[PDB]
Ligand SMILES: *[C@@]1(O)O[C@H]2CC=CC[C@H]2O1
């Protein structure tokens with residue numbers, strides 16, 4: 010399916026989406042540089058549990074418009090807003106992974122939570138990833154400069170390097186992810202808009218601390234889950250701070266898990282989601 | 289092109305199709321987990337012979353909607369019915385390969401044969417693939433349980449294993465199919481809906497024996513063709529039984545050919561189709 | 568985005584396109600067997616320079632309709648005409664690479680140059696690639712017969728062989744193009760219509776000498792640029808003749824560059840385009 014969310018010059022900006030099952034709506038928002046199918050190990054369990062599972066592809070990724078403009082969380086949240094309004098979804102469970110955790114917080118901040126039943130943040134960006142004078146716990150900017158340069162330099166070679174650290178392949182290749190599944194991740198990645206390989210990096214490092222305040226103040230059931238061997242979003246720079254800021258949220262650390270834990274630790278992610286959604 | 293065949297929640301179910309050439313219509317219905325382009329070695333010959341060649345992608349595959357629902361032959365036949373009615377095709381030659389042989393028989397059974405000139409069944413599922421008390425010639429259920437588990441377990445690795453047996457790669461890699469062509473088969477396969485990797489397996493093992501009765505009773509020119517080294521659909525469990533049940537059909541055994549014989553034995557398939565269509 | 572340019576039987580022929588930025592329009596027309604994203608190293612620089620950059624995918628390639636008909640430059644030029652008219656583009660800079668250089672010349676010949684500000688021909692086909700009695704400087708027909716046979720014989724294996732010569736991989740793999748970028752070129756190539764792998768070859772060898780007359784007589788700023796180690800379109804059979812025929816055009820030979828120089832020699836291509844567009 011497609012939902013129109015804007016225009017880029019003479020072209021409509023259309024987001025690809027899937028809408029499956031019956032029951033309470035659950036919207037799953039994927040990470041860079043994948044698409045909605047990256048949720049497949051979660052999707053099939055949620056459908057079996059009697060939820061209506063919707064995924065969509067972020068602008069620039071998967072089946073969505075390969076735009077040059079709007080790679081920022083205000084726009085990403087406006088896109089999500091249009092998806093929810095177009096489908097008139099109510100009592101929705103929003104679940105974000107990696108980039109998708111930014112949509113969740115920015116959406117609540119900008120649009121409120123009238124449509125939202127629950128929030129689940131998996132392998133989160135929050136609260137503010139890049140080190141600044143007022144954000145000493147962040148990661149130094151030079152890391153992101155280097156990522157931007159590599160992704161712009163040759164996105165094809167860059168995605169290979171990214172997935173090594175995404176999945177901790179030195180540890181997990183052949184035990185928790187096959188070579189073929191890694192290849193599938195890379196084939197999806199190179200289908201993204203060339204500019205999206207690097208244009209999203211400034212978005213990853215936006216300050217979400219005010220959005221975290223909105224999330225906490227919404228008082229909706231919230232889950233925060235992260236792997237302890239995450240080499241993309243270090244757990245001390247993200248989830249542990251997020252947990253401190255939103256102490257009311259359910260909090261899960263998946264021992265030994267990398268950033269790409271929807272696949273490598275699907276069982277643990279699924280168990281956490283099942284418990285959380287049942288509440 | 290796209291033809292709408294139904295809806296999945298808020299999304300239309302659209303089948304991708306191509307419609308080429310001029311002359312009597314010939315509709316080619318591909319096998320799992322490929323798409324309409326898998327017919328390319330046949331398509332170009334049929335076009336050269338002065339047929340109008342139409343292919344479409346089965347729901348869940350190729351360019352068609354990546355649905356969760358309807359992976360059964362009643363639905364697959366209803367999809368084909370809508371394609372034929374939408375295009376108002378008459379005097380059509382229907383040609384199925386592997387999964388596509390199920391559409392042909394179920395379509396005739398459910399909708400009759402007013403639009404159909406001829407039927408060609410290549411590497412067929414018929415008459416009833418899984419062993420049961422009333423179907424002693426079938427293959428034991430545990431085979432299909434294992435396939436379902438592998439395809440659900442990691443579809444990316446599974447498609448590699450499937451294509452080894454599909455093409456008999458130990459024998460044919462480098463002689464009747466290149467490494468690059470195998471890679472092309474795998475790239476198409478992983479584009480299918482994640483759930484479709486395993487959801488189609490129960491469909492493969494539906495009982496087609498009543499549909500075979502409808503096909504035989506239609507009295508239209510029919511061709512049944514199969515490879516003698518088919519390690520996906522064993523010739524004794526399928527084509528030889530189909531031939532016994534429909535003795536009036538033209539019958540071709542391609543000596544030494546695997547399941548993936550549209551590619552590996554394109555010349556033999558093309559020669560059979562040319563003779564059959566000329567009748 | 569899509570622009571409808573015709574019909575193939577029951578299906579509209581739709582060209583995929585992107586329309587980005589603001590400023591004077593620049594339309595980039597890709598080479599075989601790639602798509603509009605193959606321009607990414609040029610696109611991002613032109614956008615940064617304040618141009619509106621439009622790319623589209625030629626029929627049969629990338630995201631455009633996978634047709635069987637119309638693989639000839641009269642049709643390719645008519646497609647471009649429809650793109651320019653549909654978008655009502657004026658003062659356009661047309662830039663062609665490899666196959667795309669044919670659209671530029673045939674378009675001016677068939678439709679004139681009222682909408683055109685400038686023409687840039689990169690790695691050009693012109694003036695007439697195949698040797699004939701009246702074209703002694705061309706390449707012998709047997710070369711193209713062999714290419715057609717290989718591309719029809721197994722397009723998957725053929726694209727591997729093509730890209731070796733396209734990029735001069737013996738020299739450039741690991742220094743000016745990564746293995747991963749080559750893989751990205753091959754993944755895009757195999758998505759093209761099967762018939763397009765070979766149907767375009769007769770188009771490449773059309774006589775463009777009359778079109779070159781139209782281009783020269785238009786008196787618009789023109790650039791001709793070619794690599795000196797082009798092993799697809801030999802520089803003496805193409806660019807040097809084109810330069811002799813249109814002596815008024817700016818002329819650039821990129822020392823040591825292969826056919827695939829948008830990637831391998833992006834800096835040199837970009838510098839030439841920047842200078843040319845600034846005029
Ligand atoms: C996920 O999948 O999306 C982005 C944002 C967070 C870390 C980098 C990348 O991984």
Ligand SMILES: *[C@@]1(O)O[C@H]2CC=CC[C@H]2O1
Pocket residue numbers: 318319320321385386387388413492520521
């Ligand atoms: C073909 O291509 O489609 C299915 C059905 C028959 C055997 C398994 C698979 O192969």
Ligand SMILES: *[C@@]1(O)O[C@H]2CC=CC[C@H]2O1
Pocket residue numbers: 597598599600664665666667692771799800
């Ligand atoms: C480019 O990319 O397109 C065609 C036409 C010219 C030479 C062969 C091929 O390369």
